[PDB]
RNA sequence: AUUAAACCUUGUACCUUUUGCAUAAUGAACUAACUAGAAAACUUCUAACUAAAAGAAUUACAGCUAGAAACCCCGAAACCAAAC
RNA sequence: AACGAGCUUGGUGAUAGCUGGUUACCCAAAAAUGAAUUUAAGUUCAAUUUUAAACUUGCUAAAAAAACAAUCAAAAAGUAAGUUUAGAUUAUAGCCAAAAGAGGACAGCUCUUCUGGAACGGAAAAAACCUUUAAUAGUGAAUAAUUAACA
């Protein structure tokens, strides 16, 4: 089948999109060595974070007043 | 078998027990079956921690 | 038949109460009325969304007839309308066309106006002040 | 816009020259609507009734001033 | 005590205020709808 | 369907009848009365489940232990295919194994 | 079994005003449990419709068909308890306004077939209703006039709005 | 259900707003039991919802009719005449406020 | 949707079933009534008392007691006994 | 009044790895590979999946260096999951496209391995190809694939 010409300028343009992506992708701010460490401090707070959470399930604390509560569906007008 | 203000022996028991773990332990409170729950098995600690306050 | 249900004459009800306007069987029968409700539903349900994609291409359709009339294609009279700043959607214009008439003509004139105005900036290169119309306000 | 001129913004109007008020008459909510997703086993049950909250607006004056 | 002194406020226990405590009890699942129905879990 | 086309006539239940007014007296006759009787035996019921509590496989075998022998030819057949359907039923069918 | 076509004649209206136009009277009378078909009844009850009582006691009696003679029976009676228990001045002041035939209680019974089979036998029954009412059959329905039919059309084109805009 | 129920145009009752505008609701009333438990959440709207709303809206005549009664029941009246009426049982104060506030709009 | 019942636009009956596809293949003329998930060894949840629990016999190196929570329907060709 | 062996009652609610059926709403997560079996119209286990609980590192990536585009994997970084314990099934026939072997160091055809899909949009046809993060009301808007080719 032939190829339509608007098929081409459609994939043409997305080629385009992709190429530059290839030069902001080549120029790396900081090194290889430059990075290790910088971001260590953040990342173990994180998963701190996940820890206290998994390690905190518990059941819920529970209240006379909560049932005592229940009768108070039989309340009245004198 | 907890009676009056169950509320200030969680208090308590959460200070005494804090510096040993290091953090705060997780509880509940049964107040309409007036229990406290602890996690983790500190019965040795707990029951001298009773013994001395003479309950 | 210690437990039977004594209410399904209103359950049967909900049902043939949706079917009244159809013809046939269909109207009055449950085992016939409950199919053909459904599909009744269904349709409903995708034609929400499709009264918002037609009533869009009849507006599509007067536009092209409301700028034909002065001379102009649909898609030179939206595209130099947005180009010169002025946004009005496709649902106004078909009102503006129909009730406004004059109106219209001034939207049709202006519209015209920048087509012209860019074609002059292509076919004059370089540094030449573009057309008072073409001249593109900045918000910041 | 009037029977012999109009003003259009680029692509809005200056608050000076155009002053439109409106009142609230009354607000309400819509007519039961149906959702029915397409779906196999479609049932007549798995139907929600969608109603939407309404406000009705009557725009009681347009004013216009000479700043142009 | 406290807790006491709230249920003399409260009405009059009867057997209609008669609740089981929380979470006691289970919902039992029959096999009359869609989920549980049909096939029924065979 | 169809529905009745005029009302059922009233239900008027009397609160305070003699059996309503005095039901679960003697409820704890055993604990308060230096357990003398127990509880189970003020239940008026069938001989083979007065305070006893089984499946129905378990309370066909129990219905004929206590009165097997006073049963009628018709009834003690109908509850020894009874049990022998359940048998095979609890002992050899079901979902779980 | 609901028998409210016989009740119909008793109902009892309240005295006229001195200037009221006199209320033309009305009559119901049927027959139940006729031995035929309310199908082929019909065929009977529509050809009377919208005739007089001796316009159609003449087309009756020259017919074949076998619920000819019952009809007529029942538009003799309804004729004749019009006189005298409905005040009804006189007999040629009458017109069938409604007539139609209505289903039976049946009996069951064996139609024999040919090879130790068989089939369900109903032996059919039907009810026959007439209503009259006292006055010349109103006028037949005049068919519409072509200047009728394009007066519509242009009445059609009037009611045109333009649609889905404000 | 669009092609199976009635429509109709936007409208006003008499142009509420080129004039005056003009409240519609005209009269709310409510049935209520003295000792009910479906009527509990409405006793609650009673006691104290009940006089702030008739100050805020004070073209809508309130009546509270306490009787004997199984459902409590809100019954509103406009100015075209128009009814609706609106089953309350067993329902919060908080669902009663907001439910009235949308019968006076 | 519409001023308008029909014209205009959109739209390959249902269930079961096959692979997660049907223009297939099964089943349904329609109405009313009837017509198919049932058990507590282990687990979870809720309480009573607690080195003990259980109203006799049971279990226990935090247990024990009680409560709630579970496992369908229809259908052969046949086989045996005894009458007719 | 259908005898390869009568008929009636009872055993009997015979049994059926087979066919058919199995009745309210709502929210959520969710796969036909390996092994044995008078086994291949079945079941059991592994693997997967799931509900809960415990506590801590997990996924992508993973430089050098091995054993030779993989098997393995350290500091990092992007990010939130992974392991263990208790309970529980159904499932165990795929369908089509595109890649790579391997059968006659062939194509095909039959297998085997990896990848992807299951529109209301598009491709005369149109579950499988291409565009598409869930579902909601609005008479708003910008867009994707594509709407054949002008050699
Ligand atoms: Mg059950
Ligand atoms: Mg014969
Ligand atoms: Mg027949
Ligand atoms: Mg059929
Ligand atoms: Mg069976
Ligand atoms: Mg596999
Ligand atoms: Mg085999
Ligand atoms: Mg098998």
Known sequence: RTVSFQAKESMIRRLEVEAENHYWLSMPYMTAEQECGHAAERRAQAFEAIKAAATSKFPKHRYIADQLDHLNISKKWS | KVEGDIWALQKDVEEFLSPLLGKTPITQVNEVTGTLRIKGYFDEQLKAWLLEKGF | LRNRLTDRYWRVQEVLKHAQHFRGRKNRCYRLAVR??????VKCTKARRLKKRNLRTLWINRITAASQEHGLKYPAFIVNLIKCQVELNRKVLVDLAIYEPKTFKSLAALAKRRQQEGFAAALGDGKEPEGIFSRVVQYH | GADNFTLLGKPLLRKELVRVEATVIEKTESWPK???KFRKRKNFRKKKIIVNPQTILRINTIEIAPRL | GTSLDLLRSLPRVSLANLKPSPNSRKRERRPRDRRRGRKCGR | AFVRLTLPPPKVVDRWNEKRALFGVYDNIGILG???KHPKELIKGPVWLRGWRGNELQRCVRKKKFVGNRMFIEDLHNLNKRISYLYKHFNRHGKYR | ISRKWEKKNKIVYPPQL???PRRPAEIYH?????????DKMWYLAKMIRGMSIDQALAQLEFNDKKGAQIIKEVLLEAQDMAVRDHNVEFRSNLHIAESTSGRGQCLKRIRYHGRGRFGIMEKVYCHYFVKLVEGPPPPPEVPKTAVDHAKDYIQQLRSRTIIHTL | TGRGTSSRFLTSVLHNGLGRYVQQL?????????????????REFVEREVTDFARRNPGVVVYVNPRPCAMPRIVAEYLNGAVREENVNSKSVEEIKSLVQKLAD
């Open chain 7, 30 to 38: 049927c027959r139940r449990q006729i031995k035929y078909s309310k």
């Open chain 6, 34 to 36: 230096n357990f003398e």
């Open chain 7, 18 to 20: 001195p200037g009221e």
């Open chain 3, 36 to 41: 053909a409700v459904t599909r009744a539903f």
């Open chain 4, 34 to 36: 149906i959702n029915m």
């Open chain 8, 26 to 42: 005209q009269r709310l009333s409510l049935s209520l039991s003295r000792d009910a438990p479906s009527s509990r959440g409405a």
